[PDB]
Amino acid sequence: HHWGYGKHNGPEHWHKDFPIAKGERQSPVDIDTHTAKYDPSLKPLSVSYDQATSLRILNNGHAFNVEFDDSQDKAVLKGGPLDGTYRLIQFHFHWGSLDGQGSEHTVDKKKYAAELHLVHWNTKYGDFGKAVQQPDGLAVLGIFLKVGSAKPGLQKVVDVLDSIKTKGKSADFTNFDPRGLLPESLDYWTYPGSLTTPPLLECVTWIVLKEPISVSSEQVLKFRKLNFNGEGEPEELMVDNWRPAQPLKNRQIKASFK
Numbered sequence: 001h002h003w004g005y006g007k008h009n010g011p012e013h014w015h016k017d018f019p020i021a022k023g024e025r026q027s028p029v030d031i032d033t034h035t036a037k038y039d040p041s042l043k044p045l046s047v048s049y050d051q052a053t054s055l056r057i058l059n060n061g062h063a064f065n066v067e068f069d070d071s072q073d074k075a076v077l078k079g080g081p082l083d084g085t086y087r088l089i090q091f092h093f094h095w096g097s098l099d100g101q102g103s104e105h106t107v108d109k110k111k112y113a114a115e116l117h118l119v120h121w122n123t124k125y126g127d128f129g130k131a132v133q134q135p136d137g138l139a140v141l142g143i144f145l146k147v148g149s150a151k152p153g154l155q156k157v158v159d160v161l162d163s164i165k166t167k168g169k170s171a172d173f174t175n176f177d178p179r180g181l182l183p184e185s186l187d188y189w190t191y192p193g194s195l196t197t198p199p200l201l202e203c204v205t206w207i208v209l210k211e212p213i214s215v216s217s218e219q220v221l222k223f224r225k226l227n228f229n230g231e232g233e234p235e236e237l238m239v240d241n242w243r244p245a246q247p248l249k250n251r252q253i254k255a256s257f258k
């Protein structure tokens, strides 16, 4: 499998190997703020990260992942639209070559500079590989990034990127607190969707926060110095690793707020 984000292997090609790319609940989507409806049945969202155990940071050739110990209920997402308990396994970002693009979700067609995904899996399915085979297997918290002030809680990530420049590189990344990446407000939109990269499985409850976080131009510039390629291969900067918005089809986006 040779998928990526270039002209010859990018999102417009993925359907040939992954036909679900044209499916009924694909992600990301545009969030029309005038059509999304407040849902008073949504319970309060519960982000419990105080015992999170980060382990490692990895350049996988498509993004960089910060991985967590998910062998116990240490860092969990509950509530909101969710039934049951979802364990944090990793976070990563999608970002652009310029500040005017980079997010996967859009808000009234606005693109943000980047988007953070905190990925969690439903503990009722026992392991992550089983969970992705279920319609309610994953819960992903999506957080928009805009360029302005620096985000102090992001700097420890930015400063290790030099050590994982190329595909397949990893570095120890213990004692990182993901609570430092959240906005003040947990107001959100939610809808059923999919992974936004191959294999594009339709297994995700998306929870997209309304409030973006601010990062500095210097912080996002360091994202853009990473490489898609491996060491000793021609340099391809890791930029524009985002899938565009997909048809909403027979789905409603619900708001947690008035």
Ligand SMILES: CC(C)Cc1ccc([C@@H](C)C(=O)O)cc1
Binding pocket: 117, 118, 119, 132, 138, 140, 194, 195, 196, 197, 198, 199, 204
């Ligand atoms: C091998 C696959 C399962 C890895 C993967 C994890 C999470 C995502 C989505 C939810 C995302 O956050 O972009 C996409 C791919």
Ligand SMILES: [Zn+2]
Binding pocket: 092, 093, 094, 117, 196
């Ligand atoms: Zn993602």
